[PDB]
């Protein structure tokens, strides 16, 4: 199941972590702060990220992706699959 | 959940099977001999192979990968994801 | 006109220039030193590079390629098309 959900950066970030693996493509959610923004928007560990702000990052470096995430200010909107 | 583990060739090989599917890219572990080298180094069925001796075989033919693995003599070191 | 020719590093390097264009893939020979190694092995301007030491660099970053070339010490062997 896919989830499109927009997150609004909280007292501590969006309250989650990006994680990638070392020469696998793709970037995924791992640590979701209970009650944090990512959590309330429905995200769950290991949800795989597909679009950031409408852009597909599947073929993009973990670095590039983290950066695109921070580059959106108060908000970032994510399409994931889990 | 990624494993980097090195194998040392036992009485019967590294004691596992490579397996690929016909027309899918990627190569993956199928049969792990219990007690065998693959097993003790933690490998499990269906762990997907990423690096052989530090090389990325994701985009390489099952045949090239199997070959790469045998070509390392006493040992071969694998990075997989499972 | 494909050329497979091996170079042996001269007083001046292999005596030529790699050149890539900004946002085009591919890497190509630009300036061949008269009488220099590249020249005597037949190379000519704008010959497009395919294999460095038997490896296919078509899909690789100009940077990675240049590096590949220096990394071979006394010699480097190129396959190009012109």
């Amino acid at each position: 199941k896919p989830k499109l959900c927009r997150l609004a950066k909280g007292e501590n970030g969006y309250g989650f972590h990006l994680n990638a693996i070392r020469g696998l493509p793709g970037s995924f959610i791992k640590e979701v702060q209970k009650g944090g923004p990512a959590d309330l928007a429905g995200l769950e560990d290991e949800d795989v990220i597909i679009e950031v702000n409408g852009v597909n990052v599947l073929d993009e470096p973990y670095e590039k992706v983290v950066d695109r995430i921070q580059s959106s200010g108060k908000n970032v909107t994510l399409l994931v699959c889990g | 959940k990624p494993k980097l583990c090195r194998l040392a060739k036992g009485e019967n090989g590294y004691g596992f099977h490579l397996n690929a599917i016909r027309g899918l890219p990627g190569s993956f572990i199928k049969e792990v001999q219990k007690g065998g080298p693959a097993d003790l180094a933690g490998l499990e069925d269906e762990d997907v192979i990423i690096e052989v001796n530090g090389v990325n075989v994701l985009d390489e033919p099952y045949e090239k990968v199997v070959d790469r693995i045998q070509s390392s003599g006493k040992n071969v070191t694998l990075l997989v994801c499972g | 006109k494909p050329k497979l020719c091996r170079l042996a590093k001269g007083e001046n390097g292999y005596g030529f220039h790699l050149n890539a264009i900004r946002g085009l893939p591919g890497s190509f020979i630009k300036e061949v030193q008269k009488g220099g190694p590249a020249d005597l092995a037949g190379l000519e301007d704008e010959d497009v590079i395919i294999e460095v030491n038997g490896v296919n660099v078509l899909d690789e970053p100009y940077e990675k390629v240049v590096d590949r070339i220096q990394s071979s010490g006394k010699n480097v062997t190129l396959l190009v098309c012109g």
């Binding site: 990638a20 | 990624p2 980097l4 530090g54 | 010490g73």
Partner: peptide, 27 residues
């Protein structure tokens, strides 16, 4: 030479595999 290279490259893979093995960034 040929050797010298053997050494260097083997060094390299020995280094990359020295981790890290994953990447997490607090968001």
């Amino acid at each position: 030479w040929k050797i010298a290279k053997m050494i260097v490259s083997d060094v390299m893979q020995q280094a990359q595999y020295d981790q890290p093995l994953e990447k997490s960034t607090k968001l």
